[PDB]
Amino acid sequence: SMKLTIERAALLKALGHVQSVVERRNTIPILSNILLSAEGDRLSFSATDLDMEIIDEGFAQIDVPGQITAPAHTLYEIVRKLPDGADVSLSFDDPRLVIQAGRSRFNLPVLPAGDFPVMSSDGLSSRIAVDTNELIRLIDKTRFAISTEETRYYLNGLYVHTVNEGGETKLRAVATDGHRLALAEMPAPEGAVGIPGVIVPRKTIAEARRLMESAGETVDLQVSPQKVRFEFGAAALTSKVIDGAFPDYMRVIPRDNAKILTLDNDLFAKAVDRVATISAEKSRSVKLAVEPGRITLTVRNMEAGQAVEEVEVDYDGEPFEIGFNARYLLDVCGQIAGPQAEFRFADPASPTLVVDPVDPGVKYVLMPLRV
Amino acid sequence: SMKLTIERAALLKALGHVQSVVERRNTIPILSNILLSAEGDRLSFSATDLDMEIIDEGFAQIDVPGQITAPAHTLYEIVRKLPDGADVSLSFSGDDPRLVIQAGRSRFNLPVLPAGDFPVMSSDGLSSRIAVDTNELIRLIDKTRFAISTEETRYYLNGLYVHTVNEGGETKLRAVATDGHRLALAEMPAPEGAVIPGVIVPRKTIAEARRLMESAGETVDLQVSPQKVRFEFGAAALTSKVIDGAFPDYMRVIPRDNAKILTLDNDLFAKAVDRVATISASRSVKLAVEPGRITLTVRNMEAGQAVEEVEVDYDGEPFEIGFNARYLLDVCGQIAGPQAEFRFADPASPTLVVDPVDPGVKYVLMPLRV
């Protein structure tokens, strides 16, 4: 038996945190459930998709301790729709979970707690406190470049690791999908120096980042070669990592591109977006005809449509033509923090570096395509 | 057209009005296009899906008059992204076979199709213009829209029946929607000129008319024939076929003599219905009605149950009746004041819902087995 009462707001806060992990499509019914575990003065909540597990805790008045599983999204929506201030009773005498508040009564089917997946966290490092805003930045500056593919390939997560440069150790995140790269870094907090490099799955980053919005001043990170764990206070997210070595991305990031050009980032981005409008295609390529003082942008669609726009830029080198996917270019322009962007080109077939003058702790790479 | 300049704001306004009718996909390429016709001091814009046509016009400096067609959504999107205040040149000549759109440092070339292959929407036999208050016309639509069937056939249920009735010596302009499972009626006093054959206005036409009412003025002009309806919103106009067919004698489905009368707090009732309906994913709800109370029950196939008691104003015989939960919530969503009044006969008979604060609306709900 389990039997308790909990304030709607506390119940809603916890269910809200954990239910995000549950895939709407699930042909294994137990993976649609939350594990509820009541003991002492706390109701604990766990949900999983097998690759990761979110846990949270709320205060509750516990008459009889116990554990049961119940449908996650349905439980969340019931509680959401209960009146403000409602005190919520959870109990069992059918074999269903009884949720009772004011004049509403719900009976949900349950599944036994013993069939609920167990996520082991053996051999994690000690907790590493990382400033929340700094961590949010590592993710927001890079996340867009992680592939959206449905595999467990190394490109489908964010490579988190430390490196030694500029007379200190940095905590770095690198994302690449084979078409583009993003890199962001920060001075390594105490305890992060020399963590093993881990590839954190895309969905895990998305969930961590969501939980970061409601976190405090810091989030604790723990890492092992098999597992990564984020603690946000009462909530925690534990995840598998992608197995295998991440590519030697330091060879992909060009160091010696000598054709340097600076431009007004907002004007350029608007010009790119404008010329790209000619095409409705999923991928749209834009030609950059670069010459002293100017970039001429051209997009063509699959039905003889054409758009051209000239943008003045700061450049004095040899003229050349280079092509990029317009979405990848706009993604980079979207991350630039100030009004200028700096591009470093070599030849039309080589990777292009984009640097942000107001932030030396990011690097973006664009891969050219045929123009 | 052949050669003109037009302010971005004037171009965008007109393109935004007309492009909504164009389907995202068209097997006939010219149906994706806007007809541009330049003459005098006006650029005219036309777009169509063959069932209806939207037209509009804007001021322009016309150097060379003429007519051409070009991709609607693309032209709209290009203009949307041009900088504020941009003067926009449109030209078509023997140089390039494409429409040339030029503003500032931007130049676009769009493929065209000839104006002579663009569909023609005839407007022969329309009544003279009837001026209808915009908010009132909006109300007629918003009070009833939800009950139109969402099916793509040319059956009377897939449109809004707009007609004029002599109701006890007073002429009303009335709108009726039903999908065979529920009905909605709204009416207003008939404007001068309305007492017009009854027409079934297609669902999409109502949607487009309603969108255009968002940026209309004080009145909108209505014209009707047995084949066509036309809405005029100043420089913009929407002309549409009607659904050919006899709208049901809906008076036969609206119950007049339902004697079990109950009134409740609409807002609290709707919240209770929404709560119990949560446990499921066309969900029925059971209403166990007795003096002073409705007990709401929803069950699902997965063993899930939700029950809630709501206090109501009723002292008649007890009974149980079932409704589709969404249909019931749709009605409660239209009720204008704090109460709703239900009138029931027996559990297998249609139920009337009236708003005690607006006698110009009627709703009917068909029961389901409980």
PDB file of N, CA and C in Angstrom, chain A residues 73-74 77-78 80-83 96 103-109 270 273-280 284 294 301 303-312, chain B residues 73-74 77-78 81-83 96 98 105-111 271 274-280 292-294 300 302-311:
ATOM      1  N   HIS A  73       2.137  11.082 -18.429  1.00  0.00           N
ATOM      2  CA  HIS A  73       1.468  12.231 -19.044  1.00  0.00           C
ATOM      3  C   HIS A  73       0.053  12.425 -18.516  1.00  0.00           C
ATOM      4  N   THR A  74      -0.690  11.334 -18.367  1.00  0.00           N
ATOM      5  CA  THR A  74      -2.044  11.394 -17.798  1.00  0.00           C
ATOM      6  C   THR A  74      -2.023  11.937 -16.374  1.00  0.00           C
ATOM      7  N   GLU A  77      -1.348  15.778 -16.539  1.00  0.00           N
ATOM      8  CA  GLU A  77      -2.529  16.537 -17.019  1.00  0.00           C
ATOM      9  C   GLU A  77      -3.686  16.602 -16.026  1.00  0.00           C
ATOM     10  N   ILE A  78      -3.946  15.499 -15.318  1.00  0.00           N
ATOM     11  CA  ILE A  78      -4.919  15.513 -14.220  1.00  0.00           C
ATOM     12  C   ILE A  78      -4.578  16.571 -13.200  1.00  0.00           C
ATOM     13  N   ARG A  80      -2.467  19.138 -13.361  1.00  0.00           N
ATOM     14  CA  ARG A  80      -2.485  20.457 -14.011  1.00  0.00           C
ATOM     15  C   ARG A  80      -3.900  21.078 -13.992  1.00  0.00           C
ATOM     16  N   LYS A  81      -4.903  20.249 -14.243  1.00  0.00           N
ATOM     17  CA  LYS A  81      -6.307  20.681 -14.319  1.00  0.00           C
ATOM     18  C   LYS A  81      -7.048  20.746 -12.988  1.00  0.00           C
ATOM     19  N   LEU A  82      -6.420  20.303 -11.892  1.00  0.00           N
ATOM     20  CA  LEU A  82      -7.030  20.410 -10.565  1.00  0.00           C
ATOM     21  C   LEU A  82      -7.026  21.892 -10.155  1.00  0.00           C
ATOM     22  N   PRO A  83      -7.981  22.321  -9.309  1.00  0.00           N
ATOM     23  CA  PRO A  83      -8.019  23.734  -8.889  1.00  0.00           C
ATOM     24  C   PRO A  83      -6.736  24.178  -8.196  1.00  0.00           C
ATOM     25  N   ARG A  96      -5.972  -0.022  -8.638  1.00  0.00           N
ATOM     26  CA  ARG A  96      -5.566   1.180  -9.377  1.00  0.00           C
ATOM     27  C   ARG A  96      -5.115   2.274  -8.411  1.00  0.00           C
ATOM     28  N   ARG A 103     -13.797  17.470  -5.144  1.00  0.00           N
ATOM     29  CA  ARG A 103     -14.856  16.593  -5.659  1.00  0.00           C
ATOM     30  C   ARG A 103     -14.478  15.747  -6.905  1.00  0.00           C
ATOM     31  N   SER A 104     -13.182  15.650  -7.211  1.00  0.00           N
ATOM     32  CA  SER A 104     -12.667  14.796  -8.299  1.00  0.00           C
ATOM     33  C   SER A 104     -12.010  13.513  -7.781  1.00  0.00           C
ATOM     34  N   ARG A 105     -12.259  12.390  -8.455  1.00  0.00           N
ATOM     35  CA  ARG A 105     -11.610  11.116  -8.130  1.00  0.00           C
ATOM     36  C   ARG A 105     -11.165  10.419  -9.406  1.00  0.00           C
ATOM     37  N   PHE A 106      -9.891  10.022  -9.468  1.00  0.00           N
ATOM     38  CA  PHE A 106      -9.350   9.319 -10.628  1.00  0.00           C
ATOM     39  C   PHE A 106      -8.746   7.990 -10.194  1.00  0.00           C
ATOM     40  N   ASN A 107      -8.936   6.977 -11.029  1.00  0.00           N
ATOM     41  CA  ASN A 107      -8.354   5.652 -10.838  1.00  0.00           C
ATOM     42  C   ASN A 107      -7.539   5.365 -12.092  1.00  0.00           C
ATOM     43  N   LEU A 108      -6.224   5.268 -11.946  1.00  0.00           N
ATOM     44  CA  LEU A 108      -5.329   4.962 -13.056  1.00  0.00           C
ATOM     45  C   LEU A 108      -4.750   3.570 -12.911  1.00  0.00           C
ATOM     46  N   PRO A 109      -4.610   2.840 -14.030  1.00  0.00           N
ATOM     47  CA  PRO A 109      -3.946   1.539 -13.933  1.00  0.00           C
ATOM     48  C   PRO A 109      -2.477   1.695 -13.571  1.00  0.00           C
ATOM     49  N   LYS A 270      20.538  39.135 -42.810  1.00  0.00           N
ATOM     50  CA  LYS A 270      19.282  39.530 -43.434  1.00  0.00           C
ATOM     51  C   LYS A 270      19.347  39.401 -44.950  1.00  0.00           C
ATOM     52  N   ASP A 273      19.129  35.591 -45.711  1.00  0.00           N
ATOM     53  CA  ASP A 273      17.748  35.165 -45.501  1.00  0.00           C
ATOM     54  C   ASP A 273      16.825  35.619 -46.659  1.00  0.00           C
ATOM     55  N   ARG A 274      17.044  36.846 -47.107  1.00  0.00           N
ATOM     56  CA  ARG A 274      16.330  37.434 -48.241  1.00  0.00           C
ATOM     57  C   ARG A 274      16.539  36.650 -49.536  1.00  0.00           C
ATOM     58  N   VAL A 275      17.797  36.400 -49.914  1.00  0.00           N
ATOM     59  CA  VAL A 275      18.038  35.701 -51.175  1.00  0.00           C
ATOM     60  C   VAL A 275      17.606  34.241 -51.107  1.00  0.00           C
ATOM     61  N   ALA A 276      17.720  33.622 -49.937  1.00  0.00           N
ATOM     62  CA  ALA A 276      17.291  32.230 -49.736  1.00  0.00           C
ATOM     63  C   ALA A 276      15.760  32.026 -49.907  1.00  0.00           C
ATOM     64  N   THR A 277      14.996  33.094 -49.745  1.00  0.00           N
ATOM     65  CA  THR A 277      13.543  33.042 -49.884  1.00  0.00           C
ATOM     66  C   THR A 277      13.033  32.586 -51.255  1.00  0.00           C
ATOM     67  N   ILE A 278      13.822  32.821 -52.300  1.00  0.00           N
ATOM     68  CA  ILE A 278      13.502  32.354 -53.655  1.00  0.00           C
ATOM     69  C   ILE A 278      13.236  30.854 -53.721  1.00  0.00           C
ATOM     70  N   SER A 279      13.809  30.094 -52.791  1.00  0.00           N
ATOM     71  CA  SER A 279      13.693  28.651 -52.787  1.00  0.00           C
ATOM     72  C   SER A 279      12.878  28.180 -51.596  1.00  0.00           C
ATOM     73  N   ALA A 280      11.979  27.243 -51.884  1.00  0.00           N
ATOM     74  CA  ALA A 280      11.217  26.522 -50.875  1.00  0.00           C
ATOM     75  C   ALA A 280      11.877  25.196 -50.488  1.00  0.00           C
ATOM     76  N   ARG A 284      18.943  24.693 -49.159  1.00  0.00           N
ATOM     77  CA  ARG A 284      19.094  25.783 -50.124  1.00  0.00           C
ATOM     78  C   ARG A 284      20.562  26.180 -50.051  1.00  0.00           C
ATOM     79  N   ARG A 294      33.299  43.642 -51.237  1.00  0.00           N
ATOM     80  CA  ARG A 294      31.947  43.209 -51.541  1.00  0.00           C
ATOM     81  C   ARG A 294      31.762  41.689 -51.546  1.00  0.00           C
ATOM     82  N   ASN A 301      16.516  28.578 -57.331  1.00  0.00           N
ATOM     83  CA  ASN A 301      15.644  27.441 -56.962  1.00  0.00           C
ATOM     84  C   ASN A 301      15.587  26.409 -58.106  1.00  0.00           C
ATOM     85  N   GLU A 303      13.280  25.752 -60.152  1.00  0.00           N
ATOM     86  CA  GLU A 303      12.384  26.139 -61.273  1.00  0.00           C
ATOM     87  C   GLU A 303      12.759  27.474 -61.959  1.00  0.00           C
ATOM     88  N   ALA A 304      14.063  27.713 -62.101  1.00  0.00           N
ATOM     89  CA  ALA A 304      14.642  28.899 -62.752  1.00  0.00           C
ATOM     90  C   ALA A 304      14.480  30.251 -62.005  1.00  0.00           C
ATOM     91  N   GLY A 305      13.978  30.235 -60.776  1.00  0.00           N
ATOM     92  CA  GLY A 305      14.011  31.432 -59.925  1.00  0.00           C
ATOM     93  C   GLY A 305      15.444  31.774 -59.526  1.00  0.00           C
ATOM     94  N   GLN A 306      15.731  33.065 -59.381  1.00  0.00           N
ATOM     95  CA  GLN A 306      17.059  33.530 -58.999  1.00  0.00           C
ATOM     96  C   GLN A 306      16.920  34.752 -58.099  1.00  0.00           C
ATOM     97  N   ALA A 307      17.813  34.865 -57.119  1.00  0.00           N
ATOM     98  CA  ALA A 307      17.875  36.056 -56.269  1.00  0.00           C
ATOM     99  C   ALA A 307      19.313  36.436 -56.071  1.00  0.00           C
ATOM    100  N   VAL A 308      19.599  37.737 -56.175  1.00  0.00           N
ATOM    101  CA  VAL A 308      20.941  38.268 -56.027  1.00  0.00           C
ATOM    102  C   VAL A 308      20.897  39.492 -55.122  1.00  0.00           C
ATOM    103  N   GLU A 309      21.879  39.593 -54.235  1.00  0.00           N
ATOM    104  CA  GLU A 309      22.056  40.793 -53.408  1.00  0.00           C
ATOM    105  C   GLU A 309      23.532  41.029 -53.111  1.00  0.00           C
ATOM    106  N   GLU A 310      23.943  42.290 -53.185  1.00  0.00           N
ATOM    107  CA  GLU A 310      25.310  42.708 -52.884  1.00  0.00           C
ATOM    108  C   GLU A 310      25.364  43.251 -51.480  1.00  0.00           C
ATOM    109  N   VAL A 311      26.427  42.894 -50.756  1.00  0.00           N
ATOM    110  CA  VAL A 311      26.663  43.324 -49.378  1.00  0.00           C
ATOM    111  C   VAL A 311      28.083  43.886 -49.347  1.00  0.00           C
ATOM    112  N   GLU A 312      28.254  45.099 -48.833  1.00  0.00           N
ATOM    113  CA  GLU A 312      29.621  45.629 -48.660  1.00  0.00           C
ATOM    114  C   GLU A 312      30.250  44.957 -47.455  1.00  0.00           C
TER     115      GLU A 312
ATOM    116  N   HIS B  73       3.151  32.504 -52.830  1.00  0.00           N
ATOM    117  CA  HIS B  73       3.800  32.423 -51.525  1.00  0.00           C
ATOM    118  C   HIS B  73       5.219  32.995 -51.590  1.00  0.00           C
ATOM    119  N   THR B  74       5.951  32.662 -52.643  1.00  0.00           N
ATOM    120  CA  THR B  74       7.301  33.195 -52.835  1.00  0.00           C
ATOM    121  C   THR B  74       7.320  34.707 -52.961  1.00  0.00           C
ATOM    122  N   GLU B  77       6.659  36.128 -49.505  1.00  0.00           N
ATOM    123  CA  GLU B  77       7.804  35.954 -48.606  1.00  0.00           C
ATOM    124  C   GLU B  77       8.979  36.891 -48.938  1.00  0.00           C
ATOM    125  N   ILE B  78       9.256  37.074 -50.227  1.00  0.00           N
ATOM    126  CA  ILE B  78      10.279  38.002 -50.672  1.00  0.00           C
ATOM    127  C   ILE B  78       9.951  39.409 -50.155  1.00  0.00           C
ATOM    128  N   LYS B  81      10.361  40.109 -46.421  1.00  0.00           N
ATOM    129  CA  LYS B  81      11.749  40.272 -45.983  1.00  0.00           C
ATOM    130  C   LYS B  81      12.502  41.477 -46.527  1.00  0.00           C
ATOM    131  N   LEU B  82      11.891  42.232 -47.423  1.00  0.00           N
ATOM    132  CA  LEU B  82      12.474  43.469 -47.896  1.00  0.00           C
ATOM    133  C   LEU B  82      12.450  44.496 -46.764  1.00  0.00           C
ATOM    134  N   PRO B  83      13.460  45.386 -46.717  1.00  0.00           N
ATOM    135  CA  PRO B  83      13.508  46.287 -45.569  1.00  0.00           C
ATOM    136  C   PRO B  83      12.317  47.256 -45.526  1.00  0.00           C
ATOM    137  N   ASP B  96      14.291  39.242 -70.221  1.00  0.00           N
ATOM    138  CA  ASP B  96      14.319  38.034 -69.411  1.00  0.00           C
ATOM    139  C   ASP B  96      12.906  37.492 -69.512  1.00  0.00           C
ATOM    140  N   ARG B  98      11.347  36.308 -67.064  1.00  0.00           N
ATOM    141  CA  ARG B  98      10.921  36.196 -65.664  1.00  0.00           C
ATOM    142  C   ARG B  98      10.429  37.548 -65.147  1.00  0.00           C
ATOM    143  N   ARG B 105      19.348  46.889 -52.957  1.00  0.00           N
ATOM    144  CA  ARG B 105      20.460  46.080 -53.430  1.00  0.00           C
ATOM    145  C   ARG B 105      20.032  44.637 -53.750  1.00  0.00           C
ATOM    146  N   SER B 106      18.725  44.371 -53.710  1.00  0.00           N
ATOM    147  CA  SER B 106      18.151  43.042 -53.936  1.00  0.00           C
ATOM    148  C   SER B 106      17.457  42.986 -55.292  1.00  0.00           C
ATOM    149  N   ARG B 107      17.650  41.868 -55.999  1.00  0.00           N
ATOM    150  CA  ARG B 107      17.001  41.600 -57.258  1.00  0.00           C
ATOM    151  C   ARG B 107      16.586  40.137 -57.328  1.00  0.00           C
ATOM    152  N   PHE B 108      15.306  39.914 -57.619  1.00  0.00           N
ATOM    153  CA  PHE B 108      14.730  38.581 -57.731  1.00  0.00           C
ATOM    154  C   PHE B 108      14.156  38.408 -59.137  1.00  0.00           C
ATOM    155  N   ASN B 109      14.264  37.199 -59.682  1.00  0.00           N
ATOM    156  CA  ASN B 109      13.657  36.837 -60.971  1.00  0.00           C
ATOM    157  C   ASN B 109      12.791  35.619 -60.729  1.00  0.00           C
ATOM    158  N   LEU B 110      11.476  35.763 -60.897  1.00  0.00           N
ATOM    159  CA  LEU B 110      10.547  34.671 -60.694  1.00  0.00           C
ATOM    160  C   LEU B 110       9.982  34.177 -62.018  1.00  0.00           C
ATOM    161  N   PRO B 111       9.852  32.841 -62.180  1.00  0.00           N
ATOM    162  CA  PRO B 111       9.189  32.328 -63.381  1.00  0.00           C
ATOM    163  C   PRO B 111       7.721  32.723 -63.383  1.00  0.00           C
ATOM    164  N   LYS B 271     -14.721  23.084 -16.702  1.00  0.00           N
ATOM    165  CA  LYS B 271     -13.472  22.616 -16.074  1.00  0.00           C
ATOM    166  C   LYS B 271     -13.584  21.186 -15.572  1.00  0.00           C
ATOM    167  N   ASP B 274     -13.575  18.852 -18.672  1.00  0.00           N
ATOM    168  CA  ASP B 274     -12.191  18.774 -19.137  1.00  0.00           C
ATOM    169  C   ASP B 274     -11.313  17.893 -18.233  1.00  0.00           C
ATOM    170  N   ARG B 275     -11.498  17.993 -16.911  1.00  0.00           N
ATOM    171  CA  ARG B 275     -10.778  17.147 -15.962  1.00  0.00           C
ATOM    172  C   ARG B 275     -11.032  15.675 -16.166  1.00  0.00           C
ATOM    173  N   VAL B 276     -12.301  15.283 -16.172  1.00  0.00           N
ATOM    174  CA  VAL B 276     -12.615  13.869 -16.306  1.00  0.00           C
ATOM    175  C   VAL B 276     -12.261  13.307 -17.672  1.00  0.00           C
ATOM    176  N   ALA B 277     -12.315  14.144 -18.700  1.00  0.00           N
ATOM    177  CA  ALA B 277     -11.995  13.697 -20.052  1.00  0.00           C
ATOM    178  C   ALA B 277     -10.496  13.399 -20.250  1.00  0.00           C
ATOM    179  N   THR B 278      -9.653  13.921 -19.357  1.00  0.00           N
ATOM    180  CA  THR B 278      -8.207  13.665 -19.368  1.00  0.00           C
ATOM    181  C   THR B 278      -7.816  12.188 -19.452  1.00  0.00           C
ATOM    182  N   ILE B 279      -8.514  11.316 -18.731  1.00  0.00           N
ATOM    183  CA  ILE B 279      -8.070   9.915 -18.638  1.00  0.00           C
ATOM    184  C   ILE B 279      -8.079   9.187 -19.970  1.00  0.00           C
ATOM    185  N   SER B 280      -8.705   9.790 -20.980  1.00  0.00           N
ATOM    186  CA  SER B 280      -8.826   9.184 -22.294  1.00  0.00           C
ATOM    187  C   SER B 280      -8.135   9.929 -23.436  1.00  0.00           C
ATOM    188  N   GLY B 292     -30.203  18.619  -7.877  1.00  0.00           N
ATOM    189  CA  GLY B 292     -29.033  19.240  -7.266  1.00  0.00           C
ATOM    190  C   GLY B 292     -27.671  18.836  -7.833  1.00  0.00           C
ATOM    191  N   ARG B 293     -27.587  17.872  -8.752  1.00  0.00           N
ATOM    192  CA  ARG B 293     -26.257  17.335  -9.071  1.00  0.00           C
ATOM    193  C   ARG B 293     -26.136  16.655 -10.417  1.00  0.00           C
ATOM    194  N   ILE B 294     -24.992  16.858 -11.072  1.00  0.00           N
ATOM    195  CA  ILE B 294     -24.546  15.986 -12.154  1.00  0.00           C
ATOM    196  C   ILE B 294     -23.283  15.288 -11.678  1.00  0.00           C
ATOM    197  N   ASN B 300     -12.002   4.538 -19.851  1.00  0.00           N
ATOM    198  CA  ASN B 300     -11.215   4.251 -21.071  1.00  0.00           C
ATOM    199  C   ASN B 300     -11.034   2.754 -21.275  1.00  0.00           C
ATOM    200  N   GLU B 302      -8.260   1.186 -21.155  1.00  0.00           N
ATOM    201  CA  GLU B 302      -7.207   0.750 -20.267  1.00  0.00           C
ATOM    202  C   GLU B 302      -7.528   0.717 -18.794  1.00  0.00           C
ATOM    203  N   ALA B 303      -8.774   0.582 -18.423  1.00  0.00           N
ATOM    204  CA  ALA B 303      -9.165   0.529 -16.989  1.00  0.00           C
ATOM    205  C   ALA B 303      -9.272   1.812 -16.125  1.00  0.00           C
ATOM    206  N   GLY B 304      -8.762   2.893 -16.655  1.00  0.00           N
ATOM    207  CA  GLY B 304      -8.798   4.277 -16.187  1.00  0.00           C
ATOM    208  C   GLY B 304     -10.222   4.768 -15.996  1.00  0.00           C
ATOM    209  N   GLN B 305     -10.464   5.467 -14.886  1.00  0.00           N
ATOM    210  CA  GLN B 305     -11.766   6.060 -14.587  1.00  0.00           C
ATOM    211  C   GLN B 305     -11.577   7.423 -13.939  1.00  0.00           C
ATOM    212  N   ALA B 306     -12.482   8.346 -14.254  1.00  0.00           N
ATOM    213  CA  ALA B 306     -12.490   9.697 -13.688  1.00  0.00           C
ATOM    214  C   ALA B 306     -13.939  10.032 -13.349  1.00  0.00           C
ATOM    215  N   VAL B 307     -14.161  10.556 -12.144  1.00  0.00           N
ATOM    216  CA  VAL B 307     -15.503  10.890 -11.666  1.00  0.00           C
ATOM    217  C   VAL B 307     -15.431  12.242 -10.991  1.00  0.00           C
ATOM    218  N   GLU B 308     -16.417  13.083 -11.268  1.00  0.00           N
ATOM    219  CA  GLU B 308     -16.544  14.360 -10.574  1.00  0.00           C
ATOM    220  C   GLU B 308     -18.015  14.746 -10.416  1.00  0.00           C
ATOM    221  N   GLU B 309     -18.361  15.253  -9.232  1.00  0.00           N
ATOM    222  CA  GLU B 309     -19.709  15.714  -8.941  1.00  0.00           C
ATOM    223  C   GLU B 309     -19.717  17.219  -9.079  1.00  0.00           C
ATOM    224  N   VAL B 310     -20.746  17.745  -9.746  1.00  0.00           N
ATOM    225  CA  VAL B 310     -20.924  19.191  -9.906  1.00  0.00           C
ATOM    226  C   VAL B 310     -22.336  19.526  -9.444  1.00  0.00           C
ATOM    227  N   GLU B 311     -22.450  20.540  -8.596  1.00  0.00           N
ATOM    228  CA  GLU B 311     -23.741  21.036  -8.165  1.00  0.00           C
ATOM    229  C   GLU B 311     -24.424  21.781  -9.324  1.00  0.00           C
TER     230      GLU B 311
END
